[PDB]
Amino acid sequence: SSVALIVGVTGIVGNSLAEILPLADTPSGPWKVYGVARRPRPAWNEDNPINYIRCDISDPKDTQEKLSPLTDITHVFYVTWANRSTEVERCEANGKMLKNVLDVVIPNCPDLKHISLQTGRKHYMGPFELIGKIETHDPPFTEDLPRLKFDNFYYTQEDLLFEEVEKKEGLTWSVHRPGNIFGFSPYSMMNLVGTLCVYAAICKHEGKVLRFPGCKAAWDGYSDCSDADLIAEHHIWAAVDPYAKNEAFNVSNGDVFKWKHFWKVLAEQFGVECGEYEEGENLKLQDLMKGKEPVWEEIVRENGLASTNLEDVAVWWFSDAVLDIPCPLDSMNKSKEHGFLGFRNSKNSFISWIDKAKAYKIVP
Ligand SMILES: NC(=O)c1ccc[n+]([C@@H]2O[C@H](COP(=O)([O-])OP(=O)(O)OC[C@H]3O[C@@H](n4cnc5c(N)ncnc54)[C@H](OP(=O)(O)O)[C@@H]3O)[C@@H](O)[C@H]2O)c1
Ligand SMILES: CC(=O)[C@H]1CC[C@H]2[C@@H]3CCC4=CC(=O)CC[C@]4(C)[C@H]3CC[C@]12C
């Protein structure tokens, strides 16, 4: 039997992995699962049968303290990261966290088979501060083109991964580069669906229009996304498929869509009048939602929602980051050619994840 450690078990993928790994039909079942995070385990994470371990993996002491007893790890799913003001900062911060974790597990887990690291499409686009400002490789992005000549903590994290896995013979790795993730996690630092749901709710409550806070390319251009269950299935796939070992793979839903169409979906789900991209207006939810914490607190009190503060449930800057540029497509051909044929209907994905938020009473 095989034992997973999910590093970031309350994140938008960590939660998906917390729910899928213990399932019976999950490959290499039955799975023992350890799940790490910092905050006290929230209610929406309890419905999974995970061994919850509070640990701040930036602290080498706490990481040695919390993870060293875990003698029986077989697979590691790194589903976390730390944000800073400069990418160079992100590099050292995210290297240290990843290194803390690996430096403990590998010498302590004689059954450790695989280490599965999640980065993202920003590997091809450059960091936030530089997105849309640098010559990238022409999309669709394929996994084994050269890295950009700009610092990127995905690269730092990768080169680190490579070294560590050599300490244990037969230890093997995989890298997964999702696009924007449609998922569920009121704690995630990048939760597009979650943030968009709060917006619509606020709009419904105020009776205003669901205006579009994005650029024409996001409205009318092709976009794609990465369903969080699929991303979880993708982690599991490389962790167990020996012909996927030691490879980076994109993971996206297998289709495209336009926000002009999904916007109507978003509106209908919350009973709001759907707005439409207006020229030269460049709305920002970061600007448009300033000071709305009393309105949220009213929406919550009224509609019976769980006690959430929008700071947690709405990451405005990230919705802006997403909608304020055009969406470069990636390719799933390497994944498919290696056997990962999983996919998701993105429109159904969107509704599915809007509805999980409703179901957990995060939004109305
Ligand atoms: N989210 C997206 O849309 C998206 C899209 C593409 C790529 N990615 C990439 O995917 C990777 C994983 O990110 P994610 O989006 O899955 O993150 P996420 O949803 O915010 O999840 C982070 C998880 O790690 C935990 N955590 C935070 N700080 C920790 C620490 N010091 N020690 C231990 N646990 C800690 C969080 O819980 P606590 O805060 O309670 O500890 C949470 O469980 C990152 O490299 C990210 O860039 C994300
Ligand atoms: C519509 C649009 O522009 C979106 C859809 C795909 C998005 C990108 C997908 C990859 C990515 C990962 C992130 O963590 C945020 C920034 C970026 C770089 C996103 C910025 C905005 C994009 C390009």
Author numbering: 26 to 389
Show passages lifted from the paper.
In order to investigate the function of this protein, which we termed PmMOR (Plantago major multisubstrate oxido-reductase), we expressed, purified and determined its activity with different substrates including 8-oxogeranial, citral and 5β-progesterone. The structural studies and enzymatic assays presented here demonstrate that PmMOR is able to accommodate diverse substrates within its active site, to catalyse the reduction of aldehydes and carbon-carbon double bonds and to perform reductive cyclisation reactions to form the iridoid backbone. Each monomer of the protein folds into two domains, a Rossmann domain that binds NADP(H) and forms much of the active site cavity and a largely α-helical capping domain.
To investigate this, we co-crystallized PmMORV150M with progesterone and NADP+. A second dataset of wild-type protein in complex with progesterone also yielded an extended difference map peak in the same region, into which progesterone could be modeled and refined, however the crystals diffracted to lower resolution and the map was of poorer quality. Nevertheless, the binding region presented here of progesterone is largely consistent with the model suggested by Thorn et al.. and Hu et al., and places the C3 ketone in the same position as the aldehyde in our 8-oxogeranial and citral bound structures. By contrast, our data and model favor a conformation where the steroid is flipped 180° when compared to the previous models. This conformation fits the difference electron density much better as demonstrated by the higher correlation coefficients (CC with the difference map 1.75x higher for the flipped conformation) than the best fit from Thorn et al. and avoids a steric clash with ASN-205 which occludes part of the binding pocket in PmMOR.
